[PDB]
Amino acid sequence: GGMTNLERQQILTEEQYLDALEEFGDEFDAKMGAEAIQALLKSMDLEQECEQLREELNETNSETKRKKLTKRIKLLEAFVQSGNKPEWMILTVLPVLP
Amino acid sequence: KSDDVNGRTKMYKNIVDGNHQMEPGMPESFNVLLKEIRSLGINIELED
């Protein structure tokens, strides 16, 4: 929801969610289940986030800026190269033992 | 002397015939482990 003055990932409590739906109408879509996390994770570009993280690490240098970003860059690179779909983390079907 | 079912009888027959040759096979405990891993939402397989 970009037309709404709401972030992409911000916590909105039940009463807050209700009043936001009332006043913004049915524009800022939101869920409360694993479907929400699935949709958020499957709707993104790994390459764009990796490039932005690389630019941020190269530009902003600090004791905390150096850390907490390179690990994220490595995670993104591993996910890209491994080819594993992030949405696969949200399991759907359940195998059972013999 | 392990869970290799196909190997135990083979070795017994070899000893009866005096062969003294060892045929490895592959332990069934590993199969159980593989199935248990596959029981989870985990991909695993043995390549060539």
Q: Identify the CA nearest to B30 among candidates B48, B45, B13.
A: B45
Query: How many CB atoms sit inside 10 A of residue A20's CB?
Result: 19
Name the token pair of A8. 């992409």
The residue of chain B with its CA nearest to that of A97 is B39
CA distance linking residue B37 with residue B30, whole number of Å: 10
After what residues is chain B interrupted, C–N > 2.5 A? none
Taking CA atoms, B41 is separated from A55, A91, A94, B14, in Å, by 35, 7, 7, 42
Radius of gyration of chain A (CA): 18
State whether B41 and A95 contact (CB < 8 Å): yes
B36 at the A interface (CB within 8 A)? yes
Interchain contact B45–A (C-beta under 8 A) = no
From chain B, pick out residues whose CB is under 8 angstroms from the CB of A91.
Answer: 41
* DSSP state letter for A90: S
Q: Which residues of B touch A87 (CB under 8 A)?
A: none
Alpha helices of chain A — where are they, by DSSP H?
A: 14-24, 34-42, 46-59, 63-66, 70-82
The Cα–Cα gap between B21 and B11 comes to 8
Yes or no, beta carbons of B40 and A96 under 8 Å apart: no
Whether the Cβ atoms of residue A41 and residue A87 lie closer than 8 Å to each other:
yes
Give the technique used to solve this structure: cryo-EM
Instruction: Give this entry's resolution in angstroms.
Output: 6.8
Burial of B1 per CB tally in 10 Å (0-12, 13-18, 19+): exposed
Q: In 3D, which of A25, A9, A36 has the Cα closest to residue A90?
A: A36
In one-letter notation, the amino acid at residue A67 is: K
Tell me whether residues A97 and B35 touch, CB distance under 8 A.
yes
Triad A44, A47, A50: Cα angle to 5°: 100
**Beta carbons of A95 and B36 less than 8 Å apart:** no
Q: Report how far apart, in Å, the C-alpha atoms of A53 and of each of A11, A74, B20 are.
A: 24, 10, 63
The first and second tokens of residue A87, run together, are: 């949405």
- For residue A12, give the nearest of A48, A36, A45 by alpha carbon: A36
CA dihedral A74→A77→A79→A80, nearest 10 degrees, is 180
3-state secondary structure of A82: helix
